[PDB]
A paper describes a structure:
The nerve haemoglobin (Hb) from the nemertean worm Cerebratulus lacteus (CerHb) is one of the smallest naturally occurring known globins, being composed of 109 amino acids instead of the ~140–160 residues typical of most globins. Its structure shows a markedly edited globin fold with deletion of the N-terminal A helix, extension of the GH hinge region, and a shortened C-terminal H helix. A second distinct structural feature of CerHb is the presence of a long apolar tunnel that traverses the interior of the globin matrix from the heme pocket to the solvent, between the C-terminal ends of the E and H helices.
Restrained refinement of the carbomonoxy-form of CerHb (CerHb-CO) converged to a final R-factor value of 14.6% (R-free 17.9%) for data in the 24.7–1.5 Å resolution range, with ideal stereochemical parameters (r.m.s. deviation from ideal values for bond length 0.010 Å and for bond angles 1.3°). On the basis of the shape of the electron density, and in view of the way crystals were prepared (see below), we identified and refined it as the exogenous CO molecule. The final refined model indicates an Fe–CO distance of 2.09 Å and an Fe–C–O angle of 172° for CerHb-CO, comparable to that reported for Mb-CO. Two main hydrogen bonds stabilize the heme Fe2+-bound carbon monoxide molecule. Specifically, the Tyr(11)B10 OH group is connected to the Thr(48)E11 OG1 atom by a strong hydrogen bond (2.60 Å), while weaker interactions connect the Tyr(11)B10 OH group to the Gln(44)E7 NE2 atom (3.06 Å), and the Gln(44)E7 NE2 atom to the Thr(48)E11 OG1 atom (3.56 Å). As a result of the interlacing of side chains and hydrogen bonds, the heme Fe-bound carbon monoxide molecule is fully buried in the distal site, being totally inaccessible to solvent.
Residue numbers in the entry: 0 to 109
């Protein structure tokens, strides 16, 4: 099976390296990037992200619900376009299928 946990770890590395201020919205605010794997708040967030990816692939993802929750954190379309680029880089680095179509589903509600 595709190692989505490894893809997601690479995704967060890319995302927070390009946009370090995004990290301030999370329970692992301030934690060095090379330390995220040892952080409990990060472990939970990464696990939910992997779960979302598996739900999107499996056909049960609630993209409108995820979009609404991100609006609830003042996260919008621009941030998601940035995330889409970071996730594409992560997928490619692992020889994983691109998830652009899934992210476009969320973007359609942003
Ligand atoms: C590839 C695009 C993204 C995916 C798949 C994704 C996925 C998720 C998931 C699955 C959750 C948990 C939702 C829940 O518990 O109901 C979440 C929460 C969150 N996301 Fe994202 N996200 C994306 C992009 C972003 C971006 C660009 C930001 C910018 C800061 C962001 C900020 C947040 C925040 C602040 C939370 C709440 C974390 C908490 O409860 O402490 N997300 N995201």
């Amino acid at each position: 099976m595709v190692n989505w946990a490894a893809v997601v770890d690479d995704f967060y590395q890319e995302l927070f390296k390009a946009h370090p201020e995004y990290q301030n919205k999370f329970g692992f605010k301030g934690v060095a990037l090379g330390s995220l794997k040892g952080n409990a708040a990060y472990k939970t967030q990464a696990g939910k992200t992997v779960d979302y990816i598996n739900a999107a692939i499996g056909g049960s993802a609630d993209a409108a619900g995820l979009a609404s929750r991100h609006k609830g954190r003042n996260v919008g379309s621009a941030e998601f376009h940035n995330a889409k680029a970071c996730l594409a880089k992560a997928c490619s680095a692992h020889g994983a299928p691109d998830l652009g179509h899934a992210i476009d589903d969320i973007l359609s509600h942003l």
